[PDB]
């Protein structure tokens, strides 16, 4: 199936408390493989997957330089943005960058993306054709003109269409056992008496990989969402994921309600009813 | 491997 490689960067200023906190993190699909943390001792890109340890010292030095360079650009960005929005020097602000590439089941290039945010809001992003920029406001327009004049899109597209997909390809074969797996959800259902008039049915999905899953509640074949509650998919801590969905139901009518489970580790979608 | 086409805002 489809695969992805993504890198996530967070920088947060702490004026009066030294230089900004910087955390970088690498993922293949839903598996983390590298980190960098500026408050840690090593000051290096560190491994977070067993299959990436085998990379030699040229990889680790190279990744350390690139990541420390990402860090400095954000330090300057935090100062630049503080000025663009006329914010005070005393307050804490955030810069977030996310980029990467998607491939298909043949592992040919599918898609590329690069998004940038200031304080939790979209600032500037690369458009899907990978040749232009979306600028949200007046200050982002200044950034867009700067990045157009330095021809930044061209360099990014080159990384996104070449280097990114080739390293994705390499990681996928190196981490074959864990990266190309599908773990089907283990499904069960629970029942709780809220009142004598109301009842809650909870549909559980456990031990699954990848994290992408769909949980829907159906009544008599027609799906309904009006009394539905869905939690965020959560990591189990062992490389698998967990999720539930619940409905509030008139008790007695528990026979009318079916839960539908969709995941790429299911050959056919699962149905589940309280007997 | 991380990017090499990044510039300041």
């Amino acid at each position, epitope marked *: 199936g489809s695969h992805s490689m993504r890198y996530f960067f967070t920088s947060v200023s702490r004026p009066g408390r030294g230089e900004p906190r910087f955390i970088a993190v690498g993922y293949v699909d839903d598996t983390q493989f590298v980190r960098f943390d500026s408050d840690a001792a090593s000051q290096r890109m560190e491994p977070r997957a067993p299959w990436i340890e085998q990379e030699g010292p040229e990889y680790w030095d190279g*990744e350390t*330089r690139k990541v420390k*360079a990402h860090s400095q*650009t954000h330090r*300057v960005d935090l100062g630049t943005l503080r000025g663009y929005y006329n914010q005070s020097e005393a307050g804490s602000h955030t810069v977030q960058r996310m980029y990467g590439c998607d491939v298909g089941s043949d592992w040919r290039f599918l898609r590329g993306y690069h998004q940038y945010a200031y304080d939790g809001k979209d600032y500037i992003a690369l458009k899907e054709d990978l040749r232009s920029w979306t600028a949200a406001d007046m200050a982002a327009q200044t950034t867009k003109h700067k990045w157009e004049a330095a021809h930044v899109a061209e360099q990014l597209r*080159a990384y996104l269409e070449g*280097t990114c997909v080739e390293w994705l390809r390499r990681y996928l074969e190196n981490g074959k056992e864990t990266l190309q797996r599908t773990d089907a959800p283990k499904t069960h259902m629970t029942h709780h008496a809220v009142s004598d008039h109301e009842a809650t049915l909870r549909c559980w999905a456990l031990s699954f990989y990848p994290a992408e899953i769909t949980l829907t509640w159906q009544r008599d074949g027609e799906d309904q969402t009006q009394d539905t509650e869905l939690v965020e998919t959560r990591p189990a801590g062992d490389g698998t994921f967990q999720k539930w969905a619940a409905v509030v139901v008139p008790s007695g009518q528990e026979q009318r309600y079916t839960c539908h489970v969709q995941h790429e580790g299911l050959p056919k979608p699962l149905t589940l009813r309280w007997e | 491997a991380a990017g*090499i086409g*990044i510039l*300041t805002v």
Partner: T-cell receptor, first 107, second 114 residues
């Protein structure tokens, strides 16, 4: 670390000049610089994608498919094209420089 | 219009003399580099710097140290003060980002004589 070849070549005025580099390492950016005597390297071309680029008019350069190779071409050569030319390869946010190729144009 | 001034352009001194070379740059935030150039070897990186008080070593840093007390200045000081450090020395600059091309100063001719 880059092997540039040859260390000093010769062209007659008006001809075409071709110029190359080599490594066993992968590089994601290729740069070509010219150095005039008494001065530092001046950037001629920056190559990013594996393909064809022209940022002088008279200079064309190519990034290799294997990313271990690059070349520089000069057309309708002229006496001021005299100088030391250098390739630079980019990986891990570092540039690695070839050892110099030294052109002299015979008038 | 590079904005780099190397000082001095020429220095002749005996072994045992520490020599500081200065690279001045006028455009606020910049990555800065010191290289040496020698006949059979091309350009070799000595030390480089991603911002104020942040420096790291390149391939030929042995015998050299480096200072970045402010954004405008990157000082290379020849610590060992030795005849093998006879070279042409080149400061370079790069825009703050990842992988941006470097632009060089005009050079320093340094001869250390025994």
């Amino acid at each position: 670390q880059l092997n540039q070849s040859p260390q000093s070549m010769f062209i007659q005025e008006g001809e075409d000049v071709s110029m190359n580099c080599t490594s066993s390492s992968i590089f994601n950016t290729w740069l070509w610089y010219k150095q005039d005597p008494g001065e530092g390297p001046v950037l001629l071309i920056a190559l990013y994608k594996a393909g064809e680029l022209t940022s002088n008019g008279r200079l064309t350069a190519q990034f290799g498919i294997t990313r271990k190779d690059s070349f520089l071409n000069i057309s309708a050569s002229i006496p001021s094209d005299v100088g030391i030319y250098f390739c630079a390869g980019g990986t891990g946010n570092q540039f690695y420089f070839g050892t110099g190729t030294s052109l002299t144009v015979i008038p | 219009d590079a904005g780099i001034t190397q000082s001095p352009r020429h220095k002749v001194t005996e072994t045992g003399t520490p020599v500081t070379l200065r690279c001045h740059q006028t455009e606020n935030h910049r990555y800065m580099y010191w290289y040496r150039q020698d006949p059979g070897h091309g350009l070799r990186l000595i030390h480089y710097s991603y911002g104020v008080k942040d420096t790291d070593k390149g391939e030929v840093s042995d015998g050299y140290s480096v200072s970045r007390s402010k954004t405008e200045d990157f000082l290379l000081t020849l610590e060992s003060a030795t005849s093998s450090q006879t070279s042409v020395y080149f400061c370079a600059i790069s825009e703050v980002g990842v992988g941006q091309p470097q632009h060089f100063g005009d050079g320093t001719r340094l001869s250390i004589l025994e």
